[PDB]
């Protein structure tokens, strides 16, 4: 299962962003198909609840090559916001987890993709979005 993770991390700018990837420690396009070779770390697509997306091919077969082969992509449209980190350490978004311009959908990598949200307050959310009851946490101001 863990093989479905794009680890094309090349810290060329020497910024050391990978440090916060492994442990915990400041001043709008829709989600489609994204290649895994330009992704470093897990991909989190944000429905009402945060869902982790794995590495597959063009058809959806789960590939276990760590995103090394060019046939590895992420089908963000099949989970219909999504965020991910690129090879050089940039939070590439599409639609991300900002349901409210003041809040943010919490997930195990909220502080790594959005470091300026550490001082945010968590809240318990319950709502029937499309008939399905989703339970998740937010991060407002």
């Amino acid at each position, epitope marked *: 299962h863990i093989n479905r993770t794009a680890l094309n991390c090349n810290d060329s700018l020497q910024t050391g962003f*990978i440090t916060s*990837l*492994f442990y*915990a420690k400041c001043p709008p396009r829709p989600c489609d198909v994204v290649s895994a070779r330009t992704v470093c770390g897990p991909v989190y697509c944000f429905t009402p609840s945060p869902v982790v997306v794995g590495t597959t091919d063009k058809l959806g077969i789960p590939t276990y090559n760590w995103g090394e082969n060019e046939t590895d992509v992420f089908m963000l449209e099949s989970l219909r916001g999504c965020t991910w980190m690129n090879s050089t350490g940039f939070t590439k978004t599409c639609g991300g987890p900002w349901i409210t311009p003041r809040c943010l959908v919490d997930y*195990p990598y909220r502080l790594w993709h959005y470091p300026c949200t550490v001082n945010f307050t968590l809240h318990k959310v319950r709502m029937f979005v499309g008939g399905i009851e989703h339970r998740f946490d937010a991060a407002c101001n």
Partner: antibody, heavy 120, light 102 residues
């Protein structure tokens, strides 16, 4: 996961300690080293995945240098400028990561343990 | 960051592990027998490691944590160390020696 052999060296020298990895991914899990003096507690001398992340302890940050070099998943360990109190058994343990591990980093599996004696 | 265990020597019984700074439940416990390798028991103060007997329980949060054991089997008399795995540097404590009584 197997360490190197027991070594005995005189003070003011350097010791190279090796390790290995089998049955898990080397990039994800970090590889740590633990010191235990004879008849005393466990010392936290630290970790390095092949992603290039290293964070030593305050006391050992000067002379301890842990390099990954994932050629055959070695995770070497070189400790220069030895002293009499450095006589202790050294371990090569797997510390977890916030990627696959449930928390920041836990020593779920440990090494056989290599004895290093420093005396003139 | 500093750690300290309350029971120096031990002879149902529990072991204490107090920190100097506050930690929101990120402590691990370990068992080491004299001559063998340390073994993980609990890795987040509450959840025990898979394969550890259910008689090994853990409670506590914040500055003080506890390792609660009820049944004392012959395979349990050893030294027990607690580890802090919240922030760097990771730090252990002076292990408590659980000795037999006769």
């Amino acid at each position: 996961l197997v360490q190197s052999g027991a070594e005995v060296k005189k003070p003011g020298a350097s010791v190279k300690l090796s390790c290995k990895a089998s049955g898990f991914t080397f990039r994800i899990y970090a590889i740590s080293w633990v010191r235990q003096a004879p008849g005393q507690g466990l010392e936290w001398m630290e970790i390095v995945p092949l992603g290039g992340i290293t964070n030593y302890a305050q006391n050992f940050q000067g002379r301890a240098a842990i390099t990954a070099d994932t050629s055959i998943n070695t995770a070497y360990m070189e400790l220069s400028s030895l002293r009499s109190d450095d006589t202790a058994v050294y371990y090569c343990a797997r510390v977890r990561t916030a990627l696959v591990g449930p928390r920041e980093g836990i020593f779920d599996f440990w090494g056989q343990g290599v004895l290093v004696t420093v005396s003139s | 960051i500093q750690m300290t265990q309350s029971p120096s020597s031990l002879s149902r019984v529990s072991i204490t592990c107090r920190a100097s700074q506050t930690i929101s439940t990120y402590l691990a416990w370990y068992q080491q027998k004299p001559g063998k390798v340390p073994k993980l028991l609990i890795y987040t103060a509450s959840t025990l490691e898979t394969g550890v007997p259910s008689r090994f329980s853990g409670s506590g949060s914040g500055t003080e944590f506890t390792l609660t054991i009820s049944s004392l089997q012959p395979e349990d008399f050893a030294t027990y160390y607690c580890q802090q795995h919240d922030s760097h540097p990771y730090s252990f404590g002076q292990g408590t020696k659980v000795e037999i009584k006769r």
